[PDB]
């Protein structure tokens, strides 16, 4: 969250860049400085990526044991 | 036709004036579209990869 106000919030600083000095150094500087926080913003929810690998197969797992059940208490019925 | 010449004489430095706005203002048209250009390329090629 922190990331998505800082990204949305320098977007308005180089916009205060174009209208004050477009001939600043800063503005090289401005758009380097994005586009290091839209990398961050990428790096943190690659970061989820393990996290939803292993929650997965979590969810899975009980998928499985629900139906193993399921098909037990089918066939015992039957 | 000289004598044109020597009549725009004394108009020549505004001219130069004006030279040096049409350059400045040019400069600043490039910066405008440098910055869109350098997002463009943020948001299209190193954001995909």
């Given at each position: 969250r922190k990331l998505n106000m800082s990204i949305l919030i320098n977007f308005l600083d180089l916009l205060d860049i174009l209208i004050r000095?477009?001939?600043?150094?800063k503005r090289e500087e401005k758009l380097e400085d994005l586009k290091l926080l839209f990398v961050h913003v990428h790096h943190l929810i690659n970061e989820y990526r393990p996290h939803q690998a292993r929650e997965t197969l979590r969810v899975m797992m009980e998928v499985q044991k629900r139906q193993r059940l399921e098909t037990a208490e089918r066939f015992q019925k039957h | 036709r000289l004598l044109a010449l020597v009549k725009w004489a004394n108009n020549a430095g505004k001219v130069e004036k004006c030279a040096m706005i049409s350059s400045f203002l040019d400069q600043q048209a490039i910066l405008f579209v440098d910055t869109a250009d350098r997002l463009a390329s943020l948001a299209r090629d190193a954001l995909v990869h």
């Open positions: 000095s477009p001939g600043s150094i | -």
